[PDB]
Scaffold this active site. Structure first.
Site, PDB file in Angstrom:
ATOM      1  NE  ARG A 130      -3.022   0.683   3.392  1.00 37.85           N
ATOM      2  CZ  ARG A 130      -3.102  -0.447   4.099  1.00 37.85           C
ATOM      3  NH1 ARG A 130      -3.333  -1.602   3.506  1.00 37.85           N
ATOM      4  NH2 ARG A 130      -2.965  -0.396   5.420  1.00 37.85           N
ATOM      5  CG  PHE A 167      -0.922   8.585   4.403  1.00 38.27           C
ATOM      6  CD1 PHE A 167      -0.388   8.819   5.679  1.00 38.27           C
ATOM      7  CD2 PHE A 167      -2.052   7.782   4.300  1.00 38.27           C
ATOM      8  CE1 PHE A 167      -0.955   8.207   6.806  1.00 38.27           C
ATOM      9  CE2 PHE A 167      -2.618   7.216   5.453  1.00 38.27           C
ATOM     10  CZ  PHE A 167      -2.058   7.410   6.683  1.00 38.27           C
ATOM     11  CD  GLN A 179       0.564  -0.776   6.135  1.00 39.59           C
ATOM     12  OE1 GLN A 179      -0.064   0.269   6.088  1.00 39.59           O
ATOM     13  NE2 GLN A 179       0.072  -1.871   6.685  1.00 39.59           N
ATOM     14  CG  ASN A 210      -0.938  -0.888  15.522  1.00 42.61           C
ATOM     15  OD1 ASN A 210      -2.161  -0.705  15.451  1.00 42.61           O
ATOM     16  ND2 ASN A 210      -0.097   0.033  15.977  1.00 42.61           N
ATOM     17  CG  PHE A 256       3.661   3.335   8.515  1.00 41.39           C
ATOM     18  CD1 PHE A 256       3.350   2.598   9.637  1.00 41.39           C
ATOM     19  CD2 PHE A 256       3.637   4.741   8.589  1.00 41.39           C
ATOM     20  CE1 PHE A 256       2.987   3.229  10.836  1.00 41.39           C
ATOM     21  CE2 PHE A 256       3.282   5.394   9.789  1.00 41.39           C
ATOM     22  CZ  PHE A 256       2.953   4.628  10.902  1.00 41.39           C
ATOM     23  CG  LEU A 304      -0.702   7.676  12.140  1.00 39.54           C
ATOM     24  CD1 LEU A 304       0.158   7.047  11.042  1.00 39.54           C
ATOM     25  CD2 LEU A 304      -1.973   6.865  12.259  1.00 39.54           C
ATOM     26  CG  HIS A 328       0.650   3.376  14.125  1.00 40.04           C
ATOM     27  ND1 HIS A 328       0.461   2.176  13.480  1.00 40.04           N
ATOM     28  CD2 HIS A 328      -0.554   4.010  14.122  1.00 40.04           C
ATOM     29  CE1 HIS A 328      -0.805   2.091  13.090  1.00 40.04           C
ATOM     30  NE2 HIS A 328      -1.441   3.194  13.449  1.00 40.04           N
TER      31      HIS A 328
END
Ligand SMILES: CC(C)[C@@H]1OC(=O)C(C)(C)/C=C/c2ccc3ccc(nc3c2)[C@@H](C)NC(=O)[C@@H]2CCCN(N2)C(=O)[C@H](C)NC1=O
Length: 165
Positions: free
Chosen positions: A55, A60, A63, A102, A113, A122, A126
């Site tokens: 992804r 952004f 991942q 996660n 990521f 986040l 994370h």
């Protein structure tokens, strides 16, 4: 103690693109850094070599790390299928931050990521455990194969990976 450095050699539809290297903040998150280090060397008999970035959302993050199901649903750590959130000392401050993916509290595995933007929402959920050291230009090149919904237009793989120091 010296924070370890690992590298990924990235390929695009099998063609070499370049290398991304990472500093792992073992001085702040030793358990999480050790997991990513060992998965990068493959020294436990499994790890990232050959896996893909499943992804990639431009602006952004990218991942990857699912080497058991290859689509973002799998992966496992060197401690078992899951391990706990170690701490949240480090924050998502900008592009190049390396952080654990996660599915809820205390569900870290192997997926990770790389931020390509500040992702401060986040913070505290994370675990941040490293940062790109060299090759942010390669990460930016990878980003151009992403899309708004994250599906990649070419297959972005970790052709080789390991430890530098
Ligand atoms: C580790 C893995 C087992 C886990 O997968 C899941 O929980 C399951 C398998 C349920 C998939 C969920 C999922 C699927 C598609 C998405 C598309 C888009 C999005 N989120 C998505 C989340 C957007 C808003 N956010 C992300 O892309 C964030 C960025 C930070 C890293 N990061 N993704 C995760 O840590 C996600 C939150 N967790 C997982 O990917």
């Amino acid at each position: 103690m010296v924070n370890p450095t690992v590298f990924f050699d990235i390929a695009v539809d099998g063609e070499p693109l370049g290398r991304v290297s990472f500093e792992l903040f073992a001085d702040k998150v030793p358990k999480t850094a050790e997991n990513f280090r060992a998965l990068s060397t493959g020294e436990k008999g499994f790890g990232y070599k050959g896996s893909c970035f499943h992804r990639i959302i431009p602006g952004f993050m990218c991942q990857g790390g699912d080497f058991t199901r290859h689509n973002g649903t799998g992966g496992k750590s060197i401690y078992g299928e899951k391990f706990e959130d170690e701490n949240f000392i480090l924050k998502h401050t900008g592009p190049g931050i390396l952080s654990m993916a996660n599915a809820g509290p205390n569900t870290n595995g192997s997926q990770f990521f790389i931020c390509t933007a500040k992702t401060e929402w986040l913070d505290g959920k994370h675990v941040v455990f490293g940062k790109v050291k060299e090759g942010m230009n390669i990460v930016e090149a990878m980003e151009r194969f992403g899309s708004r919904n994250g599906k990649t237009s070419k297959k972005i793989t970790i052709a080789d990976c390991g430890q530098l120091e």
